[PDB]
């Protein structure tokens, strides 16, 4: 029966599957809407202690397929799913969407045939993805599965006979497998003749139906699960370019399960749940030897989070879900909505407190989110508490996150100035093969950090649809043998390709003690995408083709020194010490932000402590002008960006200074509806 004397009903007995799920260290699929409700709740509590919710703040509906295969909402009993894939549509009012926002969750039912993917789960999962794409609404996937479903035609097992080379002597081989008349019948009576393909023969006496192929009556044995999982691999791929996708790995993801996790890109892994391609036993079986002890060895976090396959880890499901929800709070409600402004106690109008010093090491995170100290909080460039770092465990050379600038959400990339000690494990399959330690210097791009940067940019672009700031501060790419061989050129280029695709505003900003130097500058220069990119250098930054040291090695050598000695010494070789020094200073006079301005390679030179005030409005002004540029784009007789921009600006009042971000932003917001009348007025002129 039950556990006997509990105060409320025992749920794991009302529905024994809930227990099955738990036995396998995961939340029962029908309990996940409850986890999301719990997390939305916490989101509110953290934003405003005092606000009063009701249960109408959060709604979950199961989605199922109707009589014509369309999805609808139903309210039914947890456990009634006939297939092993389940979905909910969720409408939730959040701090960022007080009147409510929507998304779908799809989820493997780990208790239904080991949460394996058969054809029916695959067609369902695909319908759910399309339902989300069509509405523009984000698609959360909760992966707990065993990969594709394996089978065999059980109905043939008790039937088939064998053609012995000679009987009384199995021993020596067989010719082929077959059925008898009475085999054939047993199939016809069970309505199942389609289960084999055969050929009549008679052999000395009887008649024999040679099996030539076994098809099986039960759907979901072999290749139909393959077509199955192809469909949804492709379906996820497309998703990722279309709507916010994200995946929580909740008890294990195997096979197509693993690839689904990656194709939707954004993934959070729960400690102790593996993302694998095949299991340890099956690999050991192939290799013939017990090399791997657990799946955790192959697809646990020490692998997938160190990869960048896993963007975050989580301590359990609920923590998983809190992350999804928080990641999701930077993201527009549907495809092509404005990004969700959300202002907190940290208004835009303040100095930036925390400032790097030249001789002093620091964590760039301090510059981004500020820093607790002995004598109080020192604010950084973005809103206190608003920094959601992702890919934290891979390629620690860059740091990438989401954050808010006075409410405005954006992707952020900073450069980590401390040396990373990246440690690569021995691979147990290799007889002997030791742990290997990689020193990764700071403000140098390596293959992995270049990859991560590119990756980050695409993930801001793709469903997140965010603007972006890059706090650029690289001295260059590593171009020594190991890193060339590992294709630093390949991953460097990804960065350019991603910049080219980017569809929202981008600020590049060389910070106070920062630099950009040859290659690193190039990969990030505005001309790569003049439609979206703008560059700023702090007054205490440096940029140019070489370091002053490198510069001197080539354009201020012995002869050039001595000759300067020749004119700065009334006396005139024991001055090298200081003349070398002079030359270094002479180079460095070339690398100033003043010169960047002079050559018009940057938009402004900034002062760090004034940066937040500047970027808040610059960004705000830009989102407003973008929105207008779009409105215009949807006319008929289309035109260059330059032309559209030009004629939007011809709408501003004559006194408005186009260069003044606050003024322009404020006037646009005072006039959206007037601006809108103006478009309406064009549309009529724009038949011809």
Sequence ranges of the binding site? 148-150, 252, 519, 555, 557
Which of 238, 418, 631, 647: binder of a second copy (CB under 8 A)? 238
Whether residue 446 contacts residue 440, with contact meaning beta carbons closer than 8 Å, is answered with: yes
Whether residue 138 contacts residue 238, with contact meaning beta carbons closer than 8 Å, is answered with: no
Return the number of other C-beta atoms located less than 10 Å from residue 244's C-beta: 28
Which span (77-85, 161-169, 250-258, 627-635) binds ligand GY3, by CB under 6 A?
Answer: 250-258
Residue 92 parent element (H or E): strand 85-92
Return the number of other C-beta atoms located less than 10 Å from residue 538's C-beta: 20
Q: Does 519 bind ligand GY3 (CB under 6 A)?
A: yes
Q: Does 420 bind ligand GY3 (CB under 6 A)?
A: no
Q: Using CA atoms, how far apart are residues 64 and 425, in angstroms rounded to an integer?
A: 45
| Residue 100 interface partner, choices ligand GY3, a second copy, none, CB cut-off 5-8 Å depending on type | none
| Residue 166 interface partner, choices ligand GY3, a second copy, none, CB cut-off 5-8 Å depending on type | none
Which span (45-53, 172-180, 313-321, 410-418) binds a second copy, by CB under 8 A?
Answer: 172-180
Q: Using CA atoms, how far apart are residues 173 and 144, in angstroms rounded to an integer?
A: 44
| Residue 524 interface partner, choices a second copy, ligand GY3, none, CB cut-off 5-8 Å depending on type | a second copy
Terminal CA-CA length for the chain:
79
| Residue 675 interface partner, choices ligand GY3, a second copy, none, CB cut-off 5-8 Å depending on type | none
Q: Does 518 bind ligand GY3 (CB under 6 A)?
A: yes
Encoded one letter per residue, x for contact with ligand GY3 by CB under 6 A and - for no contact, window 540-579 reads: -----xx---------------------------------
For residues 643, 648, 654, 660, the Cα torsion angle rounded to the nearest 10 degrees is: -100
| Residue 470 interface partner, choices ligand GY3, a second copy, none, CB cut-off 5-8 Å depending on type | none
- Kindly determine how many residues on this chain lie close enough to bind a second copy according to the rule CB under 8 A: 135
What backbone phi and psi angles, to 5 degrees, belong to 118?
A: -100, -175
| 233 closest CA partner among 129, 133, 335, 134 | 129
Which of 88, 131, 209, 259: binder of ligand GY3 (CB under 6 A)? 259
Encoded one letter per residue, x for contact with ligand GY3 by CB under 6 A and - for no contact, window 613-632 reads: --------------------
Chain breaks in the chain (C to N over 2.5 A) after: 572
Contacts for 266 with CB less than 8 Å, ≥ 6 apart: 245, 246, 247, 311, 327, 390, 459
Q: Which residue is listed with tokens 């208004």?
A: 347
| 332 closest CA partner among 524, 464, 152 | 464
Which of 255, 299, 300, 332: binder of ligand GY3 (CB under 6 A)? 255
Which of 364, 495, 523, 543: binder of ligand GY3 (CB under 6 A)? 523
Encoded one letter per residue, x for contact with a second copy by CB under 8 A and - for no contact, window 270-309 reads: -----xxxx---xx-x-x---xx----xxx---xx-xxxx
Q: Does 663 bind ligand GY3 (CB under 6 A)?
A: no
Residue 273 CB, shortest distance to ligand GY3, in Å, is 16
| Residue 158 interface partner, choices a second copy, ligand GY3, none, CB cut-off 5-8 Å depending on type | a second copy
Encoded one letter per residue, x for contact with a second copy by CB under 8 A and - for no contact, window 322-361 reads: ----------------------------------------
Q: Which residue is listed with tokens 């096979």?
A: 255
Q: Using CA atoms, how far apart are residues 450 and 514, in angstroms rounded to an integer?
A: 18
For the chain, how are helix, strand and coil distributed in percent, rounded to 5? 40, 20, 40
Alpha helices (H) in 190-343, listed in sequence order: 223-240, 256-263, 280-287, 296-299, 301-307, 317-328
Residue 459 CB, shortest distance to a second copy, in Å, is 13
**Would you tell me which residues interact with ligand GY3 (CB under 6 A)?**
147-148, 150, 226, 229, 233, 254-256, 259, 277-278, 476-477, 518-519, 522-523, 545-546
């Amino acid at each position: 029966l039950r556990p006997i004397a509990t105060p409320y009903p025992v749920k794991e007995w009302l529905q024994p599957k809930r227990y099955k799920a738990h036995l396998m260290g995961t939340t029962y699929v029908y309990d996940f809407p409850e986890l999301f409700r719990q997390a939305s709740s916490s989101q509110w509590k953290n934003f405003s202690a005092d606000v009063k919710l009701t249960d109408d703040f959060f709604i979950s509906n199961e989605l199922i397929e109707d009589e014509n295969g369309e999805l609808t909402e139903v309210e039914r009993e947890p456990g009634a799913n006939a297939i092993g894939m389940v979905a909910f549509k969720i409408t939730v009012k959040t701090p960022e969407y007080p009147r409510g926002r929507q998304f779908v969750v799809v989820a493997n039912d780990i208790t239904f045939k080991i949460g394996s993917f058969g054809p029916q789960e695959d067609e369902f999962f695909n319908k759910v993805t399309e339902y989300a794409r069509k509405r523009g609404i984000p698609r959360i996937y909760l992966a707990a599965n065993s990969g594709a479903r394996i089978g065999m035609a059980e109905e043939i097992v008790p039937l088939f006979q064998v053609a012995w080379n000679d009987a009384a002597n199995p021993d020596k081989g067989f010719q082929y497998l077959y059925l008898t008349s009475e085999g054939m019948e047993t199939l016809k009576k069970f309505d199942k003749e389609n289960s084999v393909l055969t050929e009549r023969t008679v052999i000395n006496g009887e008649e024999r139906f040679v099996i030539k192929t076994i098809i099986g009556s039960e759907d979901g044995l072999g290749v139909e699960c393959l077509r199955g999982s192809g469909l949804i691999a492709g379906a996820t791929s497309r998703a990722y370019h279309d709507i916010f996708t994200i995946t929580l790995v909740t008890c294990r993801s195997v096979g197509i399960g693993a690839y689904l996790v990656r194709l939707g890109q954004r993934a959070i892994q729960v400690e102790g749940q593996p993302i694998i391609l095949t299991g340890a036993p099956a690999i050991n079986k192939m290799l013939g030897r017990e090399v791997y002890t657990s799946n955790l060895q192959l697809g646990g976090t020490q692998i997938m989070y160190n990869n960048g396959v896993s963007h975050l880890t989580a301590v359990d499901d609920l923590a998983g879900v809190e992350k999804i929800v928080e990641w999701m709070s930077y993201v527009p409600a549907k495809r092509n909505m404005p990004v969700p402004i959300l202002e907190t106690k940290d208004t835009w109008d303040r100095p930036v407190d925390f400032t790097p010093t030249n001789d002093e090491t620091y964590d760039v995170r301090w510059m981004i989110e500020g820093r607790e100290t002995e004598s109080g909080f020192e604010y950084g460039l973005f809103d206190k508490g608003s920094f959601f770092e992702t890919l934290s465990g891979w390629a620690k050379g860059v740091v990438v996150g989401r954050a808010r600038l006075g409410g405005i959400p954006l992707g952020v990339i900073g450069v980590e100035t401390r040396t990373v000690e990246n440690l690569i494990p021995a691979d147990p399959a290799n007889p002997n093969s030791a742990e290997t330690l990689i020193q990764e210097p700071g403000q140098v791009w390596h293959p992995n950090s270049a990859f991560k940067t590119a990756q980050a940019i695409n993930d801001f672009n793709n469903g997140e649809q965010l603007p972006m700031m890059i706090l650029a501060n690289w001295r260059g790419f590593s171009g020594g043998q190991r890193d060339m061989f590992n294709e630093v050129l390949k991953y460097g280029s990804f960065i350019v390709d991603a910049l080219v695709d980017y569809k929202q505003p981008i600020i590049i900003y060389i910070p106070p003690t920062g630099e950009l130097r040859g290659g690193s500058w190039v990969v990030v220069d505005p001309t790569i995408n003049a439609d979206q990119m703008e560059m700023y250098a702090d007054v205490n930054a440096r940029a140019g083709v070489l370091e002053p040291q490198g510069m001197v090695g080539i354009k201020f050598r012995r002869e050039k020194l001595l000759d300067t000695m020749n004119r700065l010494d009334d006396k005139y070789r024991e001055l090298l010490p200081i003349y070398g020094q002079i030359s270094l200073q002479f180079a460095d006079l070339h690398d100033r932000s003043s010169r960047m301005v002079a050559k018009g390679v940057i938009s402004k030179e900034l002062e760090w402590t004034e940066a937040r005030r500047f970027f808040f409005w610059r960004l705000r002004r830009r989102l407003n002008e973008e929105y207008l540029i779009k409105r215009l784009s949807h006319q008929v007789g289309e035109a260059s960006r330059l032309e559209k921009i030009a004629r939007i600006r011809s709408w501003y009042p004559a006194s408005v200074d186009h260069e003044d971000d606050r003024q322009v932003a404020t006037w646009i917001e005072e006039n959206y509806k007037t601006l809108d009348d103006k478009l309406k007025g064009l549309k009529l002129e724009s038949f011809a």
